[PDB]
Amino acid sequence: RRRRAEVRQLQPDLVYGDVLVTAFINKIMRDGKKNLAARIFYDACKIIQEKTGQEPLKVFKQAVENVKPRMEVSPRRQQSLALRWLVQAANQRPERRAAVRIAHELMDAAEGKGGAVKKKEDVERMAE
Amino acid sequence: GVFVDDHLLEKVLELNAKGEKRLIKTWSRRSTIVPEMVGHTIAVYNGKQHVPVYITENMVGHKLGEFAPTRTY
RNA sequence: GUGGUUUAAUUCGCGAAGAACCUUACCAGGCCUUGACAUGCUAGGGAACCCGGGUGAAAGCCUGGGGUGCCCGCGAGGGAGCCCUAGCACAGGUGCUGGGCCGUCGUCAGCUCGUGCCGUGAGGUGUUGGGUUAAGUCCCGCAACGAGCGCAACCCCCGCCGUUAGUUGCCAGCGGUUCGGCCGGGCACUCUAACGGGACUGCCCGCGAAAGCGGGAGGAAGGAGGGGACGACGUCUGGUCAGCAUGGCCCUUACGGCCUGGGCGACACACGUGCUACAAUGCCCUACAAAGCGAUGCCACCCGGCAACGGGGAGCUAAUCGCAAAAAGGUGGGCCCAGUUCGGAUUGGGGUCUGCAACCCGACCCCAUGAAGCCGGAAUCGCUAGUAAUCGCGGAUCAGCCAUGCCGCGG
């Protein structure tokens, strides 16, 4: 208790220059292998730009933004919570490739739709 | 290669040469059955448990048990 | 492992006992002076012992030959070391219960003592307050003052620097390239070992009881650097027969001692704990990385084989004075099934091996084998730091015989 402890702060990834990136990679992270989950994200983004032509970064941030619950919310938990549904919803997708399921899950989330975004509407609506 | 009690055959070799089908006893350790036990009651003895079973021409190559029973009795 | 089943189904209150050939348990048998082994003593006779056969696989018993040293000593006797026989105590007993030793549990800070005062029956005052906190008692102020619980809290190890030494891991400029190693030379570097220095309350700012804490710069680990390790007293009053000792009872020398063979702590039901196990893995190929602990044991390396294994030669007492474990998980590339995912327990058949054997408890390989592609509501368990967690490795399994116990490290 006290001191408000710490949460540490990491650096960008490579082609995006954002912290939330690695943070999200930590969610997809499993078995302790970030190297794998890393490419899974990059490849997931590559599919986005090769299907929408838009920046895979602006689609990522926006997606997570359209998931951060307002009520159920600290500016931090908004990230932890959002990243959760983004992975869970992407874990239950039709696509066979991990990078493909996440890619679609992100695009839909960025457009304000999908299972992850649908879950939020429920939590918020059941809170208000 | 193949193991066998270096004695339970001395008493049976005579029986196989005489024609008597008596019962041979054993006192060593891993008492094993051999082809010469084709027609004899290897009723070994020591002081407690017994190991009989009249070996034939197919029952040879094994034993009765107890020396590696993953169970008992 | 416990309850339970049972010719006894190890012992004791989850686990270890370091690996159930094995003592502890059962039945049967022999001996029972020596009492499997050892120590000490008394009595008679007798000179230890060595080699060997049969019976024998309980080693009990039976038989033959040769047959040591010393003084008195000269042909043979007594006695001692020693043997056999006869007797006894210690001996031996996981056979049990009721100081001491080791250790666990409450794991974190508090308790005790002296002087003095209140003050008498005593006890307490030695933490009233603030911040920070697991042992040199956190510190300061106010408090009546002071001190101890006993050199490890940096004593040891890892990460910083500098210095010295060892140089088959190594290396800048340079030459020979021995067809890739490598040789010649090389306090520079990298690794290991030793010593000292840096180590948080210091530079600056805010509040200040200036007790302290917070933020930033330098440095950059630093006001927590991480772990190992640790207190009156109390409780389980155990366990402890791993070791040692005392008293009662048992031990009356035929489980009233001891020895061997053979066996037992397997399972039907259920729980607790650990390990492997599909949804993103497997197969094949090339191939740079990881520490610590080892070792007369392991054992690189041609050929044969699916593997195990096998035939021959060489190397070793030790890693900057050979080397094994190489390889290697991982990672990268390609690919077969849009749920046998090729994960695969277990059972069964054949062959092989360390080992006397383990053929019914071991281990490896091959075919079959699909409990089956499930991964759980009430409730509950472990951990949170470069930890949890994932995965692979190596030594001994130093506290004996290939049947995932422990420790160390890297990614």
mmCIF file of all heavy atoms in Angstrom, chain A residues 59 62-64 66 104-114 117, unseen atoms left out:
data_model
loop_
_atom_site.group_PDB
_atom_site.id
_atom_site.type_symbol
_atom_site.label_atom_id
_atom_site.label_comp_id
_atom_site.label_asym_id
_atom_site.label_seq_id
_atom_site.Cartn_x
_atom_site.Cartn_y
_atom_site.Cartn_z
ATOM 1 N N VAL A 59 -5.837 2.293 -37.452
ATOM 2 C CA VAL A 59 -6.924 1.333 -37.305
ATOM 3 C C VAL A 59 -6.831 0.632 -35.953
ATOM 4 O O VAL A 59 -7.847 0.245 -35.373
ATOM 5 C CB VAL A 59 -6.882 0.268 -38.422
ATOM 6 N N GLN A 62 -7.651 3.381 -33.051
ATOM 7 C CA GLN A 62 -9.077 3.660 -33.156
ATOM 8 C C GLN A 62 -9.893 2.492 -32.613
ATOM 9 O O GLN A 62 -10.837 2.687 -31.848
ATOM 10 C CB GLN A 62 -9.457 3.918 -34.616
ATOM 11 N N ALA A 63 -9.521 1.280 -33.013
ATOM 12 C CA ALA A 63 -10.214 0.078 -32.568
ATOM 13 C C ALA A 63 -10.251 0.011 -31.046
ATOM 14 O O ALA A 63 -11.321 -0.103 -30.446
ATOM 15 C CB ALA A 63 -9.525 -1.160 -33.129
ATOM 16 N N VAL A 64 -9.078 0.084 -30.427
ATOM 17 C CA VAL A 64 -8.974 0.035 -28.973
ATOM 18 C C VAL A 64 -9.779 1.166 -28.343
ATOM 19 O O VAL A 64 -10.346 1.010 -27.261
ATOM 20 C CB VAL A 64 -7.503 0.158 -28.515
ATOM 21 N N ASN A 66 -12.517 2.409 -29.515
ATOM 22 C CA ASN A 66 -13.930 2.070 -29.628
ATOM 23 C C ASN A 66 -14.265 0.841 -28.793
ATOM 24 O O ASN A 66 -15.232 0.132 -29.072
ATOM 25 C CB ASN A 66 -14.298 1.813 -31.092
ATOM 26 N N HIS A 104 -9.180 -8.885 -38.567
ATOM 27 C CA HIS A 104 -10.599 -8.622 -38.766
ATOM 28 C C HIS A 104 -11.219 -8.030 -37.506
ATOM 29 O O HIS A 104 -12.018 -7.097 -37.575
ATOM 30 C CB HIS A 104 -11.331 -9.915 -39.140
ATOM 31 N N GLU A 105 -10.840 -8.576 -36.355
ATOM 32 C CA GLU A 105 -11.358 -8.105 -35.076
ATOM 33 C C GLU A 105 -11.028 -6.633 -34.858
ATOM 34 O O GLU A 105 -11.789 -5.904 -34.222
ATOM 35 C CB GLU A 105 -10.774 -8.940 -33.933
ATOM 36 N N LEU A 106 -9.889 -6.199 -35.391
ATOM 37 C CA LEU A 106 -9.459 -4.812 -35.253
ATOM 38 C C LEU A 106 -10.241 -3.889 -36.182
ATOM 39 O O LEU A 106 -10.710 -2.830 -35.766
ATOM 40 C CB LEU A 106 -7.962 -4.691 -35.548
ATOM 41 N N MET A 107 -10.377 -4.295 -37.441
ATOM 42 C CA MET A 107 -11.102 -3.499 -38.425
ATOM 43 C C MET A 107 -12.538 -3.248 -37.980
ATOM 44 O O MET A 107 -13.020 -2.115 -38.027
ATOM 45 C CB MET A 107 -11.096 -4.203 -39.784
ATOM 46 N N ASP A 108 -13.218 -4.306 -37.551
ATOM 47 C CA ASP A 108 -14.598 -4.191 -37.093
ATOM 48 C C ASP A 108 -14.683 -3.275 -35.877
ATOM 49 O O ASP A 108 -15.593 -2.453 -35.769
ATOM 50 C CB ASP A 108 -15.157 -5.572 -36.740
ATOM 51 N N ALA A 109 -13.727 -3.423 -34.964
ATOM 52 C CA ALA A 109 -13.690 -2.611 -33.755
ATOM 53 C C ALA A 109 -13.463 -1.144 -34.104
ATOM 54 O O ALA A 109 -13.994 -0.250 -33.444
ATOM 55 C CB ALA A 109 -12.587 -3.106 -32.828
ATOM 56 N N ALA A 110 -12.671 -0.905 -35.143
ATOM 57 C CA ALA A 110 -12.373 0.452 -35.583
ATOM 58 C C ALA A 110 -13.596 1.079 -36.244
ATOM 59 O O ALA A 110 -13.720 2.302 -36.310
ATOM 60 C CB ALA A 110 -11.201 0.440 -36.556
ATOM 61 N N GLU A 111 -14.495 0.232 -36.733
ATOM 62 C CA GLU A 111 -15.711 0.697 -37.390
ATOM 63 C C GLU A 111 -16.889 0.681 -36.421
ATOM 64 O O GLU A 111 -18.029 0.928 -36.812
ATOM 65 C CB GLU A 111 -16.030 -0.186 -38.599
ATOM 66 N N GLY A 112 -16.603 0.386 -35.157
ATOM 67 C CA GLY A 112 -17.650 0.344 -34.152
ATOM 68 C C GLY A 112 -18.590 -0.833 -34.330
ATOM 69 O O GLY A 112 -19.809 -0.663 -34.367
ATOM 70 N N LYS A 113 -18.022 -2.029 -34.441
ATOM 71 C CA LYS A 113 -18.814 -3.242 -34.614
ATOM 72 C C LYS A 113 -17.983 -4.477 -34.278
ATOM 73 O O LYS A 113 -16.764 -4.394 -34.130
ATOM 74 C CB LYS A 113 -19.322 -3.337 -36.056
ATOM 75 N N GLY A 114 -18.651 -5.619 -34.158
ATOM 76 C CA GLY A 114 -17.956 -6.852 -33.838
ATOM 77 C C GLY A 114 -18.368 -7.416 -32.493
ATOM 78 O O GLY A 114 -19.182 -6.822 -31.786
ATOM 79 N N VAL A 117 -16.709 -5.189 -29.491
ATOM 80 C CA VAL A 117 -17.422 -3.930 -29.318
ATOM 81 C C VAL A 117 -18.834 -4.176 -28.795
ATOM 82 O O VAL A 117 -19.374 -3.374 -28.034
ATOM 83 C CB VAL A 117 -17.517 -3.156 -30.651
#
